Amino acid sequence: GPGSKPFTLPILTIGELSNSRFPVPIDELYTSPNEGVIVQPQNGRSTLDGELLGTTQLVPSNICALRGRINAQVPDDHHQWNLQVTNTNGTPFDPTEDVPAPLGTPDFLANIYGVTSQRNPNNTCRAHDGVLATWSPKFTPKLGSVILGTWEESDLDLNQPTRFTPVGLFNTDHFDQWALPSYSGRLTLNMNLAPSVSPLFPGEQLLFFRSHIPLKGGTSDGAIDCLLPQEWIQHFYQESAPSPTDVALIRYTNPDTGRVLFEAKLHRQGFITVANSGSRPIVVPPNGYFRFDSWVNQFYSLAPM
């Protein structure tokens, strides 16, 4: 009946899923206590009924991308360029909109390696590799501007359409996947944030969809953990199915036999918990996927993984 459209998950195996916090495929499922850290990502956030939260948007190639025009080079460091940002879909950025930053803006501290490209009205073009430092005092996307750094010191034009394509980490300096940038810079609080998430029942931990992103030099697992894959967010946005309780019970199922491997709790706020203790990667059957079973409550006791 009206108000009771059945909730569903898309039929997608792990090799058919994308990270919602960096534009790469999912590599594995992962669980960890993250004891003492506040888990509050702003990309990859949606309710189960299809309301996108934080800085989350639908287009996979706009995750961690920037668009705008360069108004000036920094006089005393010609490696630095001031980018006046627009939205990644091309529309002007309205700082009065009730979001933390332009949709798709990176949600973690890092030196992000990527490429800055331009095309002029006469179709002359240029591109140069470089670094987006999301920890810099000049990373102020909510105010409309960020700094780009490049090895190139001359061949970028002012007042021409510009895009930043992210590739990975440049190095590990300042890298912390759970530390949010200060979107308006020094001494100013972030606004309109999606809330932090945590397990709320003893014996449970968050379950993440993990990718190991590229690193240009150094030592790191490159781990970026998202709460929901991008395809699930895209599915819920189209379906708009109401949530009648706080938690959907989901089961990882092999479709050819019906055998169920393990179960988990999918919370209406858009994250997963499992009964497990300790940090561990999981291996799933390549042909399996999560399926909706029933609606339960916050206090339902799961079978341990």
Ligand X SMILES: C[C@H](CCC(=O)NCCS(=O)(=O)O)[C@H]1CC[C@H]2[C@@H]3[C@H](O)C[C@@H]4C[C@H](O)CC[C@]4(C)[C@H]3CC[C@]12C
Footprint of ligand X on this chain (CB under 6 A)? Answer: 79-80, 111, 130-131, 133, 136-138, 147, 149-151
Give the shortest CB-2-to-ligand X separation in angstroms. Answer: 54
Nearest residue to ligand X, by Cβ distance, number only:
149
The torsion angles phi and psi of 217, rounded to 5 degrees, stand at -165, 140
Give the shortest CB-219-to-ligand X separation in angstroms. Answer: 18
Give the shortest CB-68-to-ligand X separation in angstroms. Answer: 16
Taking the least distance from each CB to ligand X, the nearer of 185 and 242 is 185
Q: Which of 18, 22, 29, 25 is nearest to 250 (CA)?
A: 29
Give the shortest CB-8-to-ligand X separation in angstroms. Answer: 44
Taking the least distance from each CB to ligand X, the nearer of 54 and 130 is 130
Taking the least distance from each CB to ligand X, the nearer of 54 and 114 is 114
The helix (H) or strand (E) run that includes residue 166 is strand 161-169
Q: Which of 31, 66, 63, 17 is nearest to 44 (CA)?
A: 63
Vertex 123: Cα angle to 117 and 129 (nearest 5): 15
State the alpha helices, DSSP H only, in the chain: 230-239
Give the shortest CB-85-to-ligand X separation in angstroms. Answer: 16
**What is the distance between the alpha carbons of residues 163 and 62, in angstroms, rounded to a whole number?**
10
The torsion angles phi and psi of 238, rounded to 5 degrees, stand at -75, -40
Amino acid at 253: T
Q: If you search the block for the tokens 């009964």, which residue do you land on? A: 275
Taking the least distance from each CB to ligand X, the nearer of 20 and 80 is 80
Question: Tokens at residue 271, please?
Answer: 């994250």
Give the shortest CB-95-to-ligand X separation in angstroms. Answer: 21
Taking the least distance from each CB to ligand X, the nearer of 110 and 302 is 110
